Amino acid sequence: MQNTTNIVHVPVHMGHTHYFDYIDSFPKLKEGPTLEENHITNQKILREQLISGQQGLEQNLCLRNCFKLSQKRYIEFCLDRKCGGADFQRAATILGYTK
Amino acid sequence: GFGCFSIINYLYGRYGYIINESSQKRAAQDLLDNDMAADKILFKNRVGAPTRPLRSLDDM
Amino acid sequence: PVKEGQAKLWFSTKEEADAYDDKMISNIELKSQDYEDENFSPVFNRKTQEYFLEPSEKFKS
Amino acid sequence: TIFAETWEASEYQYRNKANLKTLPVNHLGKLAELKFDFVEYKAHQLIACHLYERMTIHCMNQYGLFKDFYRPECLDAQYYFKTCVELNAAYGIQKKFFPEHFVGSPYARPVPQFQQLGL
Numbered sequence: 291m292q293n294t295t296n297i298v299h300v301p302v303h304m305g306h307t308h309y310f311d312y313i314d315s316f317p318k319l320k321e322g323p324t325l326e327e328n329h330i331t332n333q334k335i336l337r338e339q340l341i342s343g344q345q346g347l348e349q350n351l352c353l354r355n356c357f358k359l360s361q362k363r364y365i366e367f368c369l370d371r372k373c374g375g376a377d378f379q380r381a382a383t384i385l386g387y388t389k
Numbered sequence: 390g391f392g393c394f395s396i397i398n399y400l401y402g403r404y405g406y407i408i409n410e411s412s413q414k415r416a417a418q419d420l421l422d423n424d425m426a427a428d429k430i431l432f433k434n435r436v437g438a439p440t441r442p443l444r445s446l447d448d449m
Numbered sequence: 450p451v452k453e454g455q456a457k458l459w460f461s462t463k464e465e466a467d468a469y470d471d472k473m474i475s476n477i478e479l480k481s482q483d484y485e486d487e488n489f490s491p492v493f494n495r496k497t498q499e500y501f502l503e504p505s506e507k508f509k510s
Numbered sequence: 511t512i513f514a515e516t517w518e519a520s521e522y523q524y525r526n527k528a529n530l531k532t533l534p535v536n537h538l539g540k541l542a543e544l545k546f547d548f549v550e551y552k553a554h555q556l557i558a559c560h561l562y563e564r565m566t567i568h569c570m571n572q573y574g575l576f577k578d579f580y581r582p583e584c585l586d587a588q589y590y591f592k593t594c595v596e597l598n599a600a601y602g603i604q605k606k607f608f609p610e611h612f613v614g615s616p617y618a619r620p621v622p623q624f625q626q627l628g629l
């Protein structure tokens with residue numbers, strides 16, 4: 291089989307230029323906001339999180355660190371030992387892991 | 390001369406609608422009045438293309 | 450008016466047949482070569498007979 | 511059987527084998543090499559292998575089959591028509607009984623069910 295053989299799952303368009311072979315465009319490629327427009331957007335999110343989203347943060351960080359453990363029995367031990375005796379399903383609802 | 394020409398080019402950019410905004414609104418509705426007048430009297434084939442503009446003097 | 454011939458249509462009722470003729474007639478665009486006609490076309494005049502590719506007599510012989 | 515005028519070129523390329531042939535569309539440039547006058551509609555030129563068939567009929571109507579049909583424009587039309595219907599018959603059977611050989615088939619490289627991942 292040809293050594294330079296690839297299978298691509300998204301559409302691409304090749305250039306019809308002599309001596310060159312490349313992908314000149316992608317079909318239906320939409321340009322989002324610029325790097326500066328995204329920056330201003332993120333600054334507004336980070337500003338509100340800095341001003342109004344810092345109270346009660348130490349408790350939520352402990353719940354998040356406990357839920358990164360491998361086994362569930364270690365998560366329950368982490369919640370009981372480090373998070374002041376929190377409930378598994380109650381902390382999972384706070385973090386947003388409950389359906 | 391370069392300064393005067395570049396200045397009057399700016400004043401006609403910033404200003405200008407003081408004297409030319411009427412002739413643009415006039416040509417704006419005129420551009421639409423003759424367009425609507427064209428659709429009334431013009432031969433359109435089964436696709437929306439005026440393939441007979443030289444049918445008569447009013448069509449041209 | 451519609452002329453009848455050996456090649457017939459494929460509709461059960463006459464209303465379906467007359468509806469097919471009305472659809473085909475409403476798409477006809479006359480292209481005449483004579484001046485003083487409402488449908489006049491010196492160039493781009495359409496033919497009114499369809500060509501059919503058939504094996505000729507030299508073909509089959 | 512292809513039920514359209516156009517087909518994806520990649521759907522007739524092999525995924526697990528070297529690609530040494532393609533299934534190209536009709537060569538419309540050969541239609542302009544006929545010296546005589548003939549009537550051809552654009553509605554018949556895209557369906558596979560049929561343009562070469564109509565070119566052969568036009569050449570066998572203008573000329574015969576003896577000492578006049580033997581010109582480069584007419585012999586290439588007959589050769590292309592015979593070769594086209596042979597390749598399409600082989601690709602058609604391979605598409606019917608070996609669909610997993612081609613790019614785009616979900617069985618060329620099957621994606622496993624989630625029950626096989628052990629999660």
Ligand SMILES: CCCCCCCCCCCCCCCCCC(=O)OC[C@H](COP(=O)([O-])OCC(O)COP(=O)([O-])OC[C@@H](COC(=O)CCCCCCCCCCCCCCCCC)OC(=O)CCCCCCCCCCCCCCCCC)OC(=O)CCCCCCCCCCCCCCCCC
Pocket residue numbers: 434439440441442443480489490491492493
């Ligand atoms: C470098 C500078 C120096 C050199 C200069 C050289 C200039 C030459 C370059 C060409 C310029 C570009 C303009 C080309 C226009 C196309 C003309 C054309 O092909 O004919 C079709 C044209 C339309 O055919 P039709 O029969 O009406 O179609 C009926 C169908 O039902 C139609 O329905 P359908 O369903 O069958 O659809 C068919 C389909 C077919 O589609 C196509 O095939 C495509 C056609 C291409 C045109 C599409 C783009 C149109 C853009 C519009 C803007 C053009 C403005 C003009 C640009 C000039 C630039 C300065 O659609 C069309 O038919 C297209 C409509 C074509 C209309 C053309 C617009 C009219 C021009 C307006 C100005 C008239 C000036 C004439 C002055 C002559 C003075 C002698 O035929 C005619 O116009 C006949 C001529 C007029 C009759 C009066 C008798 C005059 C006899 C004059 C004889 C002398 C000739 C000149 C000799 C010069 C040396 C002395």
